[PDB]
């Protein structure tokens, strides 16, 4: 029941011949899995943890300059020279300055000069890389028991593809996942600030134009391309002075717009990404399947409520005899002839007489009837639901398109049953995503919108080429409008 | 000789006394007495309930 109330909630229907189904888990999302004569389970990825990160490169933010020295070089007698340039802690640069008799030199002309000042960094960031074998995925498992540590927590590691979770009264669920098919961590990097952290690309991280050392260093003083953080100024070509630039942490924050917020102050914790998983529901069984239904009177304790997905939830208390027993619950039309709505809290059972049980399902569009109990004493609160079948279909297509756009090829496996057309979609969408990523790498959403408009205009005034161009233009316009950045 | 301060631009800031107020759906957005207190920066978002 933990998935109830989440806006990003999806349902998967049916099982394969092997009683398995392919599902994808997301941080902040939850998927409800139901099947014929099978218990309904909620899957939600709640924790992503990384163990033993390796420091790769530290970029500096706070720097101070001391021991500034300049030496007075005359023209045509070569460049000047200082003792401190022997050590790379001193940033130095050669410029050209005026010299003359007023400067106590025998000839008039443009003379050399060098300024050297020690580079001392005060505050720096850390870039850590975790191997994919150290990933830790935590998934919570909760069935629709109807009870008001109720769920089951499991640990997913690359060390064990198959993880077994025992459910009290529901049998044991066989859980199969691929931790390394989601976020590509060996290509990834974890950036650390003073107290914040970001999950950002490794290559862009190496492309940061800031002083840095490789993570293996222990001295922490041999910074590289220190010129990017200092500046030499020649106001009148009389001499140069070196001054350190300001704090780049604000500039870094303005540079991490598209990065994802992750917390690793106390252990590397991640709350983003996706996980493709193969669900095996072979050994699951309905809790309380071997129980007759309740023939006593039923009482509703919480008023019926509607979720954002059109489903309904109700809490009922039992006061007859025969506990534990099944609740006879079903959906009728206004005609009392057809059954229209079907349960998603399949096989509701009351465990204790005085303990209320939450029954949660979905009604049909328009008006219907909610039936609890049996003659005599069936509860009669009918319904009212806003919406339409066409609206539901278009909204479902919008959700599917958004999921495909934000996942990639793995979205075809979100509810795949191993069909041949599913594999065809795998291959084609994977290759088209390959070209799309190779073509649209590093551009903002406005760039995608502009290119889409251009391609649409090219297509509309061009033929199979014209329709292909307008199709790719409209799909990339959708991608640009639906992407955050 | 005579400089006049036009305006002061803040470049480092610190935030304390963080507050949060929530409302059930279809009851508008919550309000706090620091919302008028313009020393307190405020923003309204939407949260699953």
């Amino acid at each position, epitope marked *: 029941m933990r998935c109830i109330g989440i806006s990003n909630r999806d349902f998967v229907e049916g099982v394969s011949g092997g009683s398995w189904v392919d599902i994808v888990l997301e941080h902040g999302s939850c998927v409800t899995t139901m099947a014929k004569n099978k218990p309904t389970l909620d899957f*939600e990825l*709640i*924790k992503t943890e990384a163990k033993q990160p390796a420091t790769l490169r530290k970029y500096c933010i706070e720097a101070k300059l001391t021991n500034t020295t300049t030496d007075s070089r005359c023209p045509t007698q070569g460049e000047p020279s200082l003792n401190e340039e022997q050590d790379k802690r001193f940033v130095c640069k050669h410029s050209m300055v005026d010299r003359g008799w007023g400067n106590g030199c025998g000839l008039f002309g443009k003379g050399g000069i060098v300024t050297c000042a020690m580079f001392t960094c005060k505050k720096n960031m850390k870039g850590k890389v975790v191997q994919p074998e150290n990933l830790e995925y935590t998934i*919570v498992i909760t069935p629709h028991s109807g009870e*008001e*540590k109720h769920g089951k927590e499991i640990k997913i590691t690359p060390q064990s593809s198959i993880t077994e979770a025992e459910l009290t009264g529901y049998g044991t669920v066989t859980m199969e996942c691929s931790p390394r098919t989601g976020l590509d961590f060996n290509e990834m990097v974890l950036l650390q600030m003073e107290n914040k952290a970001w999950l950002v690309h490794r290559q862009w991280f190496l492309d940061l134009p800031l002083p840095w050392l490789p993570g293996a260093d222990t001295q922490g003083s041999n910074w590289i391309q220190k010129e990017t953080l200092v500046t030499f100024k020649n106001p009148h070509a009389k001499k140069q002075d070196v001054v350190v630039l300001g704090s780049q942490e604000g500039a870094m924050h303005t540079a991490l717009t598209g990065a994802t917020e992750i*917390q690793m*102050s*106390s252990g590397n*914790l991640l*709350f983003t990404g996706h996980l493709k998983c193969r669900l095996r529901m072979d050994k699951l069984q309905l809790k309380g399947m071997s129980y007759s239904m309740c023939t006593g009177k039923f009482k509703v*304790v*919480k008023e019926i409520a509607e979720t954002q997905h059109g489903t309904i939830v109700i*809490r009922v208390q039992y006061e007859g005899d025969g506990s534990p027993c099944k609740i006879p619950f079903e959906i009728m039309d206004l005609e009392k002839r057809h059954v229209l709505g079907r349960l998603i809290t399949v096989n509701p059972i009351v465990t204790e007489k*005085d*303990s*209320p049980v939450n029954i949660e399902a979905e009604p049909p569009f328009g008006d219907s009837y909610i039936i609890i109990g049996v003659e005599p004493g069936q509860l009669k609160l009918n319904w009212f639901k806003k919406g339409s079948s066409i609206g539901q279909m278009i909204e479902t297509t919008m959700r599917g398109a958004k999921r495909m756009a934000i996942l990639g090829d793995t979205a075809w496996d979100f509810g795949s049953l191993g069909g041949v057309f599913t594999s065809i979609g795998k291959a084609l969408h994977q290759v088209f995503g390959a070209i799309y990523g190779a073509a649209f790498s590093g551009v903002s959403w406005t760039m995608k919108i502009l290119i889409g408009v251009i391609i649409t205009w090219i297509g509309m005034n061009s033929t199979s080429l014209s329709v292909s161009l307008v199709l790719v233009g409209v799909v990339t316009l959708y991608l640009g409008v639906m992407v955050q950045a | 000789k005579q400089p006049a301060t036009l305006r002061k631009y803040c470049i480092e800031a610190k935030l304390t006394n963080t*507050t*949060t*107020d*929530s*409302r*059930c759906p279809t009851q508008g957005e*919550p309000s*706090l007495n620091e919302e008028q207190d313009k020393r307190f920066v405020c923003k309204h978002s939407m949260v699953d309930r």
Partner: antibody
Amino acid sequence: EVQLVESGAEVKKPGASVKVSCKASGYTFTSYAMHWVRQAPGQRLEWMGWINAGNGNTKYSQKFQDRVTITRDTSASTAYMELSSLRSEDTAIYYCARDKVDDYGDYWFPTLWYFDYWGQGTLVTVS
Amino acid sequence: ALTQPASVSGSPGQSITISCTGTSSDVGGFNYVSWFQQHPGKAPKLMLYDVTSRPSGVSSRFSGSKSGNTASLTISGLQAEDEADYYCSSHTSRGTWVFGGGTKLTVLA
């Protein structure tokens, strides 16, 4: 099973500082939030505040914002706190309570069954 | 704060109702309403959270209900051991917790 152990009673002059602690045993201390509720003799219950044992966030009541500081100790599974600027009315019995944090380790929304267990109580006397 | 009667007394084996009234920000706004018993010299214990529901290990005689801005706790079949202090607690939308004024339950001899 679940047991909470509090420190012994202390008597101090008004205006001083008193430090007490509550130990959590029989359950995961990190995945639970520690609350503190005091009750003066013959008075009502008051919510002093709470501390998160997962990350360290602390929230205090307005009446004790500048007088109560709460710390933690993950290794010993015990929470430390100190109350300063004592007054005569501060004489009360303090109870520590537990509450499950969310799956993300935060305490934005308490669970339905919060305050399921309470400590034995520690008396602070001001004279 | 939460306002509740100072003391409520009733005959043993009878049904009595105790009401806790707050504001729309704590009691009427959210369902985080709980009740506790304060024995003399003993720590408080929880017997009812989310008034529509009950905790484990608690007899079903205690029943809770909410009427808008007022939360009501109903006990059927009063007994001698019920004589103790009672408190009502609610969690407001500001993130703080409020408690009632304390009510002592008396059972007629």
